[PDB]
Structure formats: structure tokens, C-alpha cells
Structure 1
Amino acid sequence: MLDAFSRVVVNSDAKAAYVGGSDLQALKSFIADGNKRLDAVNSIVSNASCMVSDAVSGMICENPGLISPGGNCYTNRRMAACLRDGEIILRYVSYALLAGDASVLEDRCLNGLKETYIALGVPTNSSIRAVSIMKAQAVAFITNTATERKMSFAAGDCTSLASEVASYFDRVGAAIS
């Protein structure tokens, strides 16, 4: 995998260029906003058990045919195998937000995920809904606009980190369409 630092290296290795002064300044600004990012990913991994229960119950709360006999989340064993698909998608986003890159999302999390979902008989559109509920939850903790849990932070604004973690959940839903 790569991170935010070795994405600049593999883009300059294609040109045989040293890492100069212009793209060092975009990396020097990554480190200066580094305490925001560790404050950001601490917000999501502290609330991660409530998020995967708010997600896949609300997917069932909109789609009540998934628990009918002949549904994907019908029995008790298949419900735990959707709860396990909540917290792996949420885990690999949490690595991608911590790294500053979407390498670990691409070659591990989405690698072969659609081809598995065809062969099992997973509903395609219902996985787009439960990921986007977790997109609605993740920006609610980065912007601290959650309804029943408030977390204390320093004074400032982190609207750029909430947009970066929103683009990671759209990349999950774009791969399993």
C-alpha cells in the first residue's frame, strides 16, 4: 500500500525527478494539519460499534423485504455476515483516512469484492445504501454535528477532512455497483 507521502514519491519516480520544493510544500502542509487528522480518526474509531448498528438496521428499516424468507439478511447467520461487512468497510476507510490515501481501499477492500457479491447473490443497491448511511455518520463526527454524542475538541474547523472521508465512501459504492 501507499500513503500520502509515498504517493508523491511514485508520481516523481515516473519522471525520475527529485522531490522538489513545490510538492514538498503540499507535504509540509500535510504534517502541519496532522494533529487535526489524528483528532479526526479518533472520532470515528471511538463510535464504530454504534455506527454499524445504526447503518444496517436503517437499511433494513427502509428495505423490509431483506428479512422476508428469500432475503439476503433473512436468518441469524446471514445477519452477522452483514454486520461483518459493516465493520470491514468501516475499518478500511479508517486506514485510508489515517494514511491520507486510497491505496489500502483499492487493492485490499475493493479487490474482488464485486465478483464475490455476484457469486453469493448479494443485492447490489442495498450495499450502496448502507455505505452511504456510514457516510452520513462519518461527516457528523468530523464536523461534530452528531445528535446525541458531543465530543470535545480544540477551536477550529475541519471541513476538508470531512470531504476527504466522504470521497472514500463514494469510492466504496462506485466499485460494487
Structure 2
Amino acid sequence: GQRRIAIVAKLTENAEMIVSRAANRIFVGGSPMAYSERQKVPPDFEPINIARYGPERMQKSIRDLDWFLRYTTYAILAGDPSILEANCLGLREILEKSCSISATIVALLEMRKNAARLFKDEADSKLVSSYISVVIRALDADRSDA
């Protein structure tokens, strides 16, 4: 109930910072959140914001992180991570032609850890950590998925 409402409200109030830390960590060569339209493992082989990817890839890159954060709040209000895992079950096959999967998994890890930073770990810090861990767990393998 009201705990879940407060948890999702706390994510929504500063969702920008959570995406910002992950984007700045995995994207080097500029400011990733200048490309966000809201303003309007060997982990990283850091893509350059203009050289390797380009603007059209950059917009998808910035959008999908905020989309992931939004669906986490969706499942948080929901009872289970079904909305998450049904949407990240076969996602890497779509992504991997233009995806650094190892780059994205470390971004998800940073997102989970930063979201845990916000809360006091009553049950809230473990809840968001468990929900975001579902995305990474269902994403990695490339063969247990789909």
C-alpha cells in the first residue's frame, strides 16, 4: 500500500539523477543527458557520444534507460515483476546488433545501486534492488532468454 506509493513517488521525484549517474558512467565523450528529450564483467569499453554511436543511436540509448526506470516503478506499484521480465525476456536479441550488452548491464547495476542509495533499507531499498535485479538477471545469458 502506502509504503509502495511512497517508494514509487521517491523514484519519480528524482528519477533524473538515477539515469544521470548511469549515463555519465557508461557514456564518455560528452554529456549524455543533453540528448535526453526530458530536458526539452569487463564493464565499459566507453562509446564516444558522437564518434561511435551518433545522435540517432544516442537518443535511443538515453530513452531506454528512463524507460527501464519507469517500468520499475510500474512493477513496484504492481504486485510482481511480470511487466519487467515479459519485456526484458527477449530484449537482447533485438539490441545486440547495436548494443554493448556488457555496457548496459553495468548501467543497470549502477541504476540499482544508486536507487538503493536513496532509501533507508527498511524494506524499500531491498525492494527496488530486487526489482531491478530481475531486469539484469533476465537479460544476461543470451540463451536462457527467449
- Give the conservation status (yes or no) of the 8 Å contact 2:89–2:139: no
Aligned pairs (5 A) from 1:1-177 = 34-61=1-28, 63=44, 65-67=46-48, 71=52, 74-107=53-86, 109-118=87-96, 120-143=97-120, 158-177=121-140
CA distance in 2, matches of 1:129, 1:55: 8
Structure-2 change in CA distance of 1:65 and 1:141 (3 Å) = closer
The residue matched to 2:16 in structure 1 has which SS? helix
- Give the conservation status (yes or no) of the 8 Å contact 2:45–2:103: no
- Give the conservation status (yes or no) of the 8 Å contact 1:41–1:97: yes
Aligned length: 126
CA distance in 2, matches of 1:176, 1:35: 30
Q: Select the structure of larger CA radius of gyration.
A: 1
TM-score (norm 1): 0.63
- Give the conservation status (yes or no) of the 8 Å contact 2:89–2:138: no
- Give the conservation status (yes or no) of the 8 Å contact 2:44–2:102: no
- 1:51: how far off? 1.8
Structure-2 change in CA distance of 1:39 and 1:121 (3 Å) = same
CA distance in 2, matches of 1:38, 1:83: 26
Q: Where do 4+ consecutive residues of structure 1 move more than 3 Å? A: 61-65, 68-71
The residue matched to 1:65 in structure 2 has which SS? coil
% of aligned pairs identical? 30
Deviations along 1:76-115, one digit per CA (max 9) or x if unpaired, are 22211111111111011111111131111122x2143121
CA distance in 1, matches of 2:2, 2:50: 49
- Give the conservation status (yes or no) of the 8 Å contact 2:26–2:46: no
CA RMSD of aligned residues (A): 2.1
CA distance in 2, matches of 1:168, 1:42: 16
CA distance in 1, matches of 2:83, 2:89: 10
Structure-2 change in CA distance of 1:68 and 1:99 (3 Å) = closer
CA distance in 1, matches of 2:20, 2:103: 15
The residue matched to 1:138 in structure 2 has which SS? helix
- Give the conservation status (yes or no) of the 8 Å contact 1:96–1:104: yes
- Give the conservation status (yes or no) of the 8 Å contact 1:114–1:175: no
Letter in 1 for 2:126: S
